[PDB]
Symmetry: C2
Subunit: 109 residues, 2 copies
């Protein structure tokens, strides 16, 4: 089991903002296995669980914010997601090291 | 000179909204040569002039609107741009037939 930092792109997630605007946002997660036994102990492997939880964390963070609250605070949303995702992955012995939010797309009807 | 409807994609234009949000918007223009002598009379050819004026019209329409005014009114901005671009192309004997605004991107810093 690789103990180096690992990164993935979160594939774009289309969801409604608090004020019902459709947005699609992509991002990037950097994490490392801090506890390799816990990383292999679960029914879901650790990389797959981190990827699925990253999608859920991003979707939830967006869904509680109005579009304006999302645009001005893109860095803070990342940092708070880094915390939420780090807590959610502790069961797999994963330390989330960094989350980045990239382009916000407002796709047409 | 082809008298059929012609279309092009407006390549994405990065500009500031009235309230200083960076957005990039692409779109599509459908036009037809209604007067073929006027279409070939100018120093700039008609297709190239329509493409350049479409970029200018889009950039200006966006730059006079706050982000919120742009998101809720995407169809109306197209229709008004169709009018503005149709006036601006009359010197080339062009009839603009339709303008469409597609995805709005908010690119990261």
């Amino acid at each position: 089991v690789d103990m180096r930092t690992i990164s993935f792109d979160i594939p774009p997630q289309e969801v409604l903002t608090k004020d019902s605007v459709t947005i699609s946002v992509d991002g990037v997660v950097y994490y490392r296995v801090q506890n390799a036994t816990l990383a292999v102990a679960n029914i879901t492997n650790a990389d797959s669980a981190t990827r699925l939880l990253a999608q859920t964390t991003l979707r939830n963070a967006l869904g509680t914010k109005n579009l304006s609250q999302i645009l001005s605070d893109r860095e803070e949303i990342a940092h708070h997601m880094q915390s939420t995702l780090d807590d959610a992955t502790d069961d797999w012995g994963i330390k989330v090291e960094r989350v980045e939010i990239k382009d916000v797309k407002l796709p047409v009807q």
